[PDB]
Subunit: 135 residues, 10 copies
């Protein structure tokens, strides 16, 4: 990635900022700018490319062959019992929360068993994350 | 990705900002700008490319062959019992929440068993995330 | 992706902003701008490309062969009992919510068993996400 | 994707903004602009391309062969009992909600068993998401 | 990655900042700037490349062969019981929360069993993370 | 009064009481009784008795002469307000009574201004008094 | 008063009491009784008795002469307000009573201003008094 | 008063009491009784008795002469306010009573201003008094 | 008073008491009794008795003459306020009572201003007094 | 008073008491009793008795003459406020009582201003007094 940028407030080439009650007198500004950008990226010079896979099985016997891919959850138990037995009292509950499984951003490209891959793969994630604000 | 950008408030090439009760006197501004951008990206020079897969099975016997792909949940149990037995009291509940499974952004490109892939894959995710604000 | 941009408030090439009770006197502005952008992207020079798959089975016997693709949920149980037995009391419930399974944005391109793919795949997701605001 | 943009409030090439009770005196503005954009994208130079798949089965016997594609839910149970037995009390419920399965945007391109694909696939999702606002 | 940048507040080439009630007298500014950037990246000069895999099994017998990919959860139990038995007292709960499994950003490129990969893979993650602010 | 008697249960001269499952064998009872009572009471031996009253008023003047006998109530106020404002409750009232002025036995012989009395006056009061029994 | 008697249970001259499962064998009872009572009471031997009252008023003037006998109540105020404002509660009232002025036995012989009395006056009061029994 | 008697349970001249499961064998009882009572009481031997009162008023003037007999109540105030404001509670009231003015036995013989009395006056009061029994 | 008697349980001349499971064998009882009582009481031997009162007023003037007999209450105030403000509690009231003015036995013979009395006056009061028994 | 007696349980001339499971064998009882009582009391031997009172007022002036008999209450104030403000507690009140003015036995013979009395006056009071018993 030639250019990746996280700029919180302001991004600019040339910035003239006059802010919060200043007195701005005689000014002359002369800006002479020549800018050239030439981008050649991911150009590929390739005569011949071969992707070839071959499998042969003969005079063979297979019984109870098991291939199980990734990300198996099987047996997972979430038990979160909450019991409140307020008899004769005062209870104030403000900004109270319970969360079990929260997934914001899930990015998954390739999960397989057998893979032949020729090329380019790029993942870019940018975020501002504020979970809980109260009061 | 040639250009990826997270600019919180303002993005500009040339910015003249006069803000919050300033006094802006005699100014002359002369801007002379020449800008050239030439973009050649992902150009590919390819004579011959072959993707070929072959399978042959002969004089073979297969029994109880099991292939199970990824992301298997099988047995998952969520038990969240809540019991409130307020008898003779005062209870104020403001900004209270329960969430079990929350998925905001799920991006998945390729899940398989056998894959031959020639090319380019790009995933870009940008977000501002504020979950809970109260009060 | 040549240009991907997250600009919170304002994006502009040349910006003259006069805001919040300023006094704007004698100004002369001369802007002379020449801009050229030439975009050649994803051009491909390809003489011959072959995608070929062949399978032959002979003198073979197959019994109980099982292929199960990805994303199998099987057995999932959500139990969320809520019991409220307010007898002689005061209960105020404001901004209270329960959510089990919430999916905002799901993007899935390709899930298979056997795939041969030649080309380009691009996924871009941009969002501003505010879940709960109350009070 | 040459240009993808998330601009919250305002996007413009040249912006003259006079806002909130300013006094705007003698100004002369001269803007001389020449802009050329040439877009050649996804041009493909291809002489011969062949997509060919062949299967032959002979002198073979198959019994109980099972292929099951992805996204199988099988057995899923949602039990959310709510019982309220208010006897002699005061209950105020404002901004209260229960949601089990909410799907806003689901985008799925290709799910199969066997796929040969030549070409280009692009998915772009942009949204502003505010779930619950009350009070 | 030629350029990766985390700029908290402001990024600019030339910045003239007049802020917080200054008095700005006679100034003349002359800026003469010529800037050229030429980017050739990821260009590859390749005559012939071959990716080839072959497997043959003959006169062999296989029984109870088990291959299980990564990320197996098997048996996981979350037990978080909470019981409150307030009898005749005063309880104020403000900014109280319980969270079991929270995943913000998960990026996974390739998990497999057998993989042959020719190319380039890039992952960039930038975020500002504030979890809980209250009071 | 020669004989005044309060005998709660039984009064008798000679009492043979066989009670509550006794065995009463050979008995011979011989009772020889001689009883003489001679009553001379309130015999009066009187030759001459004179009751004489005389009043004479002469050459006299009387104005605003006021004689007021006994037992004057004049101004008496009984105020017993009872207000019951049962809103949403349970009230059981069993054996509840209000009494202001209760007079059981009033015996008055002589009230006068001027009295001359020769003789005998006797008042005898006997009672069993149980006011309130409940439950 | 020659004989005044308060005998709670039993009064008798000769009492043979066989009670509560006794065995009463050979008995011979011989009772020989001679009883003489001679009562001479209140016999009076009187030759001459004179009751004489005389009043004479002459050459006299009387104005605003006031004679007021006994037992004057004039101004008496009984204020017994009872207010019950049971809102949301449980009240059980069993054996509850309010009494202001209760007079059981009032015996008054002579109230006057001027009295001449020759003779005998006797008052006898006998009672068993149980006011409130409950439960 | 020759004989005044308070006998709680039993009064008798000769008492043979066989009680509570005794065995009563050979008995012979011989009772020989002679009893003489002679009562001469209140016999009076009187030749001459004179009761004489005389009043004479002459050449006299009387103005604002006030004679007020005994037992004057004038101004008496009974204020017994009772207020019960049970909100959300439990109140059990058993055997509860309020009494202001209770008079059981009032015996008054003579109240006057001027009295001449010749004779005999006797007052006898006998009672068993139990006010409140509960439970 | 020749005979005044307070006998709690039993009064008798001759008492044979066989009580609580005794064995009563051979007995012979011979009782020989002679009893004589002669009562001469209050006999009076009187020849001449004179009760004489005389008043004369002459050439006299009387103004504002005030004679007020005994037992004057004038101004008496009873204030007994009771306020119970049970909010959210438990109150059990058993055997609770309030009494202001209770008079059981009032015996008054003579109250006057001027009294001449010849004779005999006797007052006898006997009682068993139990006020409050509960539980 | 010749005979005044307080006998708690039993009074008798001759008492044979067989009580609480005794064995009573051969007994012979011979009782020979002669009893004589002669009562001469309050006999009076009187020839001549004179009660005489005389008042004369002449040539006299009386103004504001005030005679006030005994037992004057004038101004008496009873203030007994009771306030109970039980909020959220437990109060058990058993055997609780308030009494202000309790008079059991009042015996008054003579109150006057001027009294001439010839004779005999006797007052006898006997009681068993138990006020409060509980529990
Ligand atoms: C600069 O500004 C001042 C303002 O007081 C003005 O008098 C003066 O002429 C200006 N000079 C130039 C060169 O513009
Ligand atoms: C502006 O820049 C160009 C760049 O080649 C130059 O030729 C020209 O003379 C400059 N003019 C001024 C006024 O600076
Ligand atoms: C690569 O591209 C050039 C033109 O840019 C062409 O002359 C050349 O033949 C291409 N390569 C092959 C192997 O054909
Ligand atoms: C395959 O698994 C089953 C049960 O898991 C088992 O009974 C069987 O014997 C296995 N296969 C072989 C060839 O052992
Ligand atoms: C600058 O502004 C001032 C304002 O006071 C004016 O008098 C003066 O003429 C201006 N000068 C020029 C060169 O514009
Ligand atoms: C503006 O820039 C161009 C760039 O070639 C230059 O030729 C020209 O002289 C400049 N003019 C001025 C007034 O700066
Ligand atoms: C590549 O493109 C050029 C023209 O840009 C063409 O002359 C050449 O023949 C192409 N390559 C092949 C292998 O044909
Ligand atoms: C396949 O599985 C079943 C049950 O899981 C089992 O009974 C059978 O024996 C297995 N196949 C072989 C060839 O063992
Ligand atoms: C600048 O503005 C002022 C306003 O006070 C004016 O008097 C003056 O003539 C202006 N100068 C020019 C050069 O426009
Ligand atoms: C404007 O820019 C062009 C760019 O070639 C230049 O030729 C011309 O002289 C410029 N004119 C002015 C007034 O700056
Ligand atoms: C590629 O395109 C050019 C024209 O742009 C053409 O002359 C050439 O023949 C093409 N390539 C092939 C292999 O034909
Ligand atoms: C296939 O599965 C069934 C039940 O799961 C089993 O009974 C059978 O034996 C299996 N096939 C073979 C060839 O074992
Ligand atoms: C600038 O504006 C002012 C307003 O006060 C005016 O007097 C003056 O003539 C103007 N100057 C020009 C050059 O327009
Ligand atoms: C405007 O720009 C063009 C660009 O070629 C230039 O030729 C021309 O001279 C410019 N005119 C002015 C007045 O700036
Ligand atoms: C296919 O499945 C059925 C039931 O699942 C089973 O009875 C049968 O045996 C299986 N086929 C073979 C060839 O075993
Ligand atoms: C600088 O500013 C002052 C303002 O007081 C002005 O008098 C003076 O003429 C200015 N000088 C120049 C060279 O602009
Ligand atoms: C501006 O920079 C260019 C760069 O080549 C130069 O030729 C020109 O003379 C410069 N002009 C000025 C006024 O500095
Ligand atoms: C590498 O690229 C050059 C041109 O930049 C080309 O002449 C040369 O043939 C390429 N290498 C091979 C092995 O073809
Ligand atoms: C590489 O590209 C050049 C043109 O840039 C071309 O002449 C050459 O033939 C290419 N390489 C091969 C091996 O063809
Ligand atoms: C495969 O596993 C099963 C159970 O796990 C077992 O009974 C069987 O014997 C295994 N296979 C062999 C060949 O042992
Ligand atoms: C007394 O009674 C008994 C009863 O058993 C009897 O046998 C006996 O004859 C009796 N005796 C007399 C004297 O009556
Ligand atoms: C009974 O009593 C009288 C009394 O005088 C007597 O004369 C008589 O003899 C008695 N008789 C018996 C059998 O006791
Ligand atoms: C009698 O009473 C009245 C009013 O009470 C009064 O006006 C009058 O004067 C009185 N009599 C005399 C003689 O004063
Ligand atoms: C007394 O009683 C008994 C009873 O057993 C009897 O046998 C006996 O004869 C009796 N004797 C007389 C004298 O009555
Ligand atoms: C009974 O009593 C009288 C009394 O005078 C006596 O004369 C008689 O003899 C007695 N008789 C007996 C049997 O006791
Ligand atoms: C009294 O009574 C007797 C008779 O009992 C009688 O002879 C006598 O005369 C009486 N007294 C007078 C004074 O007469
Ligand atoms: C009698 O009373 C009245 C009012 O109470 C009063 O006015 C009057 O003067 C009184 N009599 C005399 C003689 O004063
Ligand atoms: C007394 O009683 C007994 C009872 O056992 C009896 O045998 C006996 O004869 C009795 N004797 C007399 C004298 O009555
Ligand atoms: C009974 O008593 C009287 C009394 O006088 C006597 O004369 C008699 O003899 C007695 N008799 C007996 C049997 O005791
Ligand atoms: C008293 O009574 C007797 C008779 O009992 C009688 O003879 C006598 O005369 C009486 N007294 C007078 C004074 O008469
Ligand atoms: C009697 O009383 C009244 C009022 O109480 C008073 O006015 C009057 O003067 C009194 N009598 C005399 C004679 O003073
Ligand atoms: C006394 O009693 C006994 C009872 O055992 C009896 O045998 C005996 O005869 C009795 N004696 C007399 C004198 O009664
Ligand atoms: C009984 O008593 C009297 C009293 O006088 C006597 O004369 C008699 O003899 C007595 N008799 C006996 C049996 O004791
Ligand atoms: C008293 O009484 C006797 C008789 O009991 C009588 O003779 C006598 O005369 C009486 N007294 C007078 C004074 O008369
Ligand atoms: C009697 O009382 C009244 C008021 O109490 C008073 O005014 C009056 O003067 C009194 N009498 C005399 C004679 O003073
Ligand atoms: C006394 O009693 C006994 C009882 O055992 C009896 O045997 C005996 O005869 C009795 N004696 C007399 C004198 O009664
Ligand atoms: C009883 O007592 C009297 C008293 O006088 C006497 O004469 C008699 O003899 C006594 N008798 C006996 C049996 O004791
Ligand atoms: C006293 O009493 C006696 C008789 O008991 C009598 O004779 C006598 O006269 C009395 N006294 C006077 C003074 O009379
Ligand atoms: C007293 O009483 C006696 C008789 O008991 C009588 O004779 C006598 O006369 C009385 N006294 C007077 C003074 O009369
Ligand atoms: C009597 O009392 C009253 C008020 O108490 C007073 O005014 C008056 O003067 C008194 N009498 C005399 C004679 O003073």
């Amino acid at each position: 990635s030639i250019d990746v940028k996280y700029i919180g407030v302001k991004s600019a080439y040339v910035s003239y900022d006059v802010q919060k009650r200043t007195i701005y007198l005689n000014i002359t500004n002369t800006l002479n700018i020549t800018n050239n950008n030439y981008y050649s990226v991911e150009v590929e010079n390739i005569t011949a490319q071969v992707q070839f896979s071959k499998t042969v099985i003969g005079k063979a016997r297979l019984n109870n062959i098991t291939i199980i891919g990734p990300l198996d959850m099987k047996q997972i138990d979430y038990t979160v019992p909450t019991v409140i037995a307020e008899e004769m009292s005062y209870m104030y509950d403000f900004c109270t929360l319970i969360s079990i499984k929260v997934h914001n951003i899930v990015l998954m490209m390739q999960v397989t068993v057998t893979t032949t891959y020729f090329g380019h793969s790029e993942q870019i994630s940018q975020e501002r994350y504020q979970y809980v604000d109260c009061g």
